[PDB]
Amino acid sequence: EDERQSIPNVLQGEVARLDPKFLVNLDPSHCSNNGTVHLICKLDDKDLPSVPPLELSVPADYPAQSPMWIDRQWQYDANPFLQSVHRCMTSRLLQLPDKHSVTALLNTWAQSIHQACL
């Protein structure tokens, strides 16, 4: 009895059920065993692409606003359009009551990216 590969299965099992529009991968494993959560996602759809988020979560109780935007400053000072995208992103994230990293994060991010077209 041991996982030996990741956190409790529920998170991966649920995220693997998402749309093909999202493309999730892992960065250098700085929390390989216990944390095992720092996701890099690439929105692939009929919309403009952007920088992937951080998405570093906590134990499965999920009181985790996972994204921390490690590359916030310079990647966001680039263009006004993506700056407005980031503004709408954080504004909608603030509206999320007890956000849930599993689905709420990526869904809200996609909604904000689709709101960018004004």
């Binding site: 403009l48 692409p49 680039a78 263009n79």
Partner: protein, 233 residues
């Protein structure tokens, strides 16, 4: 070949230039071969431009440098013989885009190709050297000052130092040519341009000289204590 007329039609209409990505992904098989990406446009779009910065299209490059193939852009803007053209205007836009490019850091290539990226970086510096060419005549200010400024900026320590070291320890001929060009530029910089100018250039030269030496060379001091190990042994 369709890519050229495609990006032309893109410019031919006043697109939002961020929805442009949608049309780009649509017009292409979306992953067939990205070696024919925006990388070459910057050249060809500027080809007929000549003595003109060609604005309203650099916005595409701006919305692209967020996440694209930075290696191809780097090597092509390095090999671009634009200082030879001596437009003195487009080169400024090149400095501006290189600012947003290199200031923070480069990106990953997920393969050994990224190492070659570092290689391109070397050639990049050579390009910046030809900024002094804009002052080679000196028969009559802003351009040389700005070029040396952005050069010193891109030469931030602990950021590209390892990449320059990799470049130097992966090939020599280009490194020797870059060193000779640096020596020549330093020699050419023996004129009293300004107080701010011709000062930091020596600093960047010393940085390049220290590049092959080490990153943690033994420079510590103030070790006030009688060494007992040597004594005892």
């Amino acid at each position: 070949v369709n890519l050229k007329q495609a990006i032309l039609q893109a410019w031919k209409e006043r697109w939002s230039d961020y929805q442009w990505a949608i049309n780009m992904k649509k017009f292409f098989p979306k992953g067939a071969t990205w070696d024919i990406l925006n990388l070459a446009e910057a050249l060809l779009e500027q080809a007929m431009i000549g003595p003109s910065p060609n604005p309203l299209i650099l916005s595409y490059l701006k919305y692209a440098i967020s996440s694209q193939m930075v290696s191809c852009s780097s090597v092509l803007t390095a090999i671009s013989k634009f200082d030879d053209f001596s437009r003195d205007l487009c080169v400024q836009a090149l400095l501006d885009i290189m600012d947003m490019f290199c200031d923070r850091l480069s990106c990953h290539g997920k393969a050994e190709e990224c190492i070659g990226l570092c290689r391109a970086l070397l050639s990049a510096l050579h390009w910046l050297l030809r900024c002094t060419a804009a002052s080679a005549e000196r028969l009559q200010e802003k351009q040389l000052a700005l070029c040396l400024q952005c050069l010193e900026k891109t030469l931030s320590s602990t950021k590209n130092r390892a990449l320059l070291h990799i470049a130097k320890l992966e090939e020599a001929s280009s490194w020797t040519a870059i060193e000779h060009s640096l020596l020549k530029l330093g020699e050419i910089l023996a004129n009293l341009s300004n107080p701010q100018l011709r000062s930091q250039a020596e600093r960047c030269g010393t940085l390049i000289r220290s590049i092959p030496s080490m990153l943690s060379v033994h420079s510590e001091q103030l070790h006030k204590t009688g060494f007992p190990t040597i004594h005892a042994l």
